[PDB]
Write a protein that binds this ligand. Structure first.
Ligand code: ANP
Ligand code: MG
Length: 353
């Protein structure tokens, strides 16, 4: 319901010594599901707090629709006037308050009567399917129920924007799938603009329609998840969005050489970094007669693993320590020599310089 325009936003700490965010530019569309991915310390929470209005840009401006909300160290529209709901990385339900009281809390000074408060809480409780446990204390609720109460609390003032800072971190795995689905269902039910942050890529493919990657305070790439996956601007972005094999080779007239392997791509530097995802590699004991796979050379199996019902096969080129891993329904014993094939249009190459 609200468009977020981030114009040249920077944020410093330690009197300037630490640049948490450096000239960030992004336009998040109204009603969009937007994700931010980046390593620990990249500036995700700092970004979220600036959007929430809990902090301000040191330089630059922030607009909600055409409304200036912060500018160069000044808060123009305070958090309480921004129509935002948040579930922060270290969110906590008040242990001594029931679910009702936890959800009602944000309404205490909103000039609404007891009846108006009850009606609003029950309404959002129904949306989150926890209307039946409103009288329970948080310790009496399941993990899923707790997450629902936290969401209801963030949605009780009818916000236009919902901010989630690493929401599915306190989850095991079965719960994560469920929690991700819930976030999507309630974003649909209310139409809110949604910003979610994480150092975990699974949440991004699950929830986000567009994603921004933050590295050391810099927004290095923005695009649809599949765009970042297939066309990463760097090997670092490549690895953040998904598994990838990273190899360093010498640039040659014929291609990039890594031991006995030769990849048919080129850059400019004398050295190159090759990125190849596991699904874009295939191993074989004989030549593959398929124009969709390209032979890059011989390899030797180093070790095999077994996870997720699949075998993880790790090989190295002849005369190299560089590893390449892939997944297969069938195993190949260590020490066996194999032909290594790749999807050519899927080879990612970057300068080492
Ligand atoms: N109040 C503060 N004072 C000083 N430094 C800060 C403050 N808040 C954040 N930082 C620093 O700014 C950088 C970004 O912090 P932060 O935005 O919290 O990263 P993050 O991406 O959320 N990390 P993580 O949650 O572990 O994935 C780090 O170098 C922090 O140490
Ligand atoms: Mg954080």
């Amino acid at each position: 319901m609200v468009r977020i325009i981030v114009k040249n936003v920077s944020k410093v700490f330690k009197k300037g010594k630490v640049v948490a965010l450096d000239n960030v530019n992004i336009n998040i569309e109204n009603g969009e599901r937007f994700g931010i991915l980046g390593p620990s310390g990249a500036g995700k929470t700092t970004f979220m707090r600036i959007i929430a209005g809990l902090d301000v840009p040191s330089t630059g401006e922030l607009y909600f629709d055409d409304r200036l909300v912060a500018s160069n160290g000044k808060l123009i529209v305070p958090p309480e006037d921004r129509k935002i709901g948040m579930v922060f990385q270290t969110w906590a339900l008040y242990p001594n308050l029931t679910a009702f009281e936890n959800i009602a809390f944000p309404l205490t000074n909103m000039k609404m009567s007891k009846e108006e408060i009850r009606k609003r809480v029950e309404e959002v409780a129904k949306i989150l399917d926890i209307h039946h446990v409103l009288n329970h204390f948080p310790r009496e609720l399941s993990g899923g129920q707790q997450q629902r109460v936290a969401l209801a609390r963030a949605l009780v003032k009818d916000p236009s924007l919902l901010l989630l800072d690493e929401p599915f971190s306190n989850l095991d795995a079965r719960m994560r799938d469920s929690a991700r689905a819930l976030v999507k269902e309630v974003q649909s039910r209310l139409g809110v603009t949604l910003l979610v942050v994480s150092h975990d890529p699974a949440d991004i493919f699950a929830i986000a329609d567009r994603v921004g990657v933050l590295v050391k305070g810099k927004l290095v790439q923005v695009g649809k998840p599949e765009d970042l996956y297939d066309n990463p601007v760097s090997i670092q972005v490549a690895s953040l969005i998904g598994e990838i094999n990273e190899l360093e080779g010498k640039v040659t007239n014929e291609g990039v050489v890594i031991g006995s392997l030769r990849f048919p791509v080129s850059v400019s530097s004398d050295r190159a970094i090759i990125g190849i995802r596991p699904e874009d590699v295939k191993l074989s004991k004989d030549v593959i007669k398929d124009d969709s796979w390209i032979l890059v050379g011989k390899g030797k199996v180093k070790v095999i693993g077994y996870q997720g019902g699949l075998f993880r096969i790790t090989i190295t080129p002849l005369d190299s320590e560089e590893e390449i891993f892939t997944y297969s329904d069938h195993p190949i014993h260590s020490g066996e020599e194999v032909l290594v094939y790749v999807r050519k249009d899927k080879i990612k190459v970057f300068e080492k310089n």
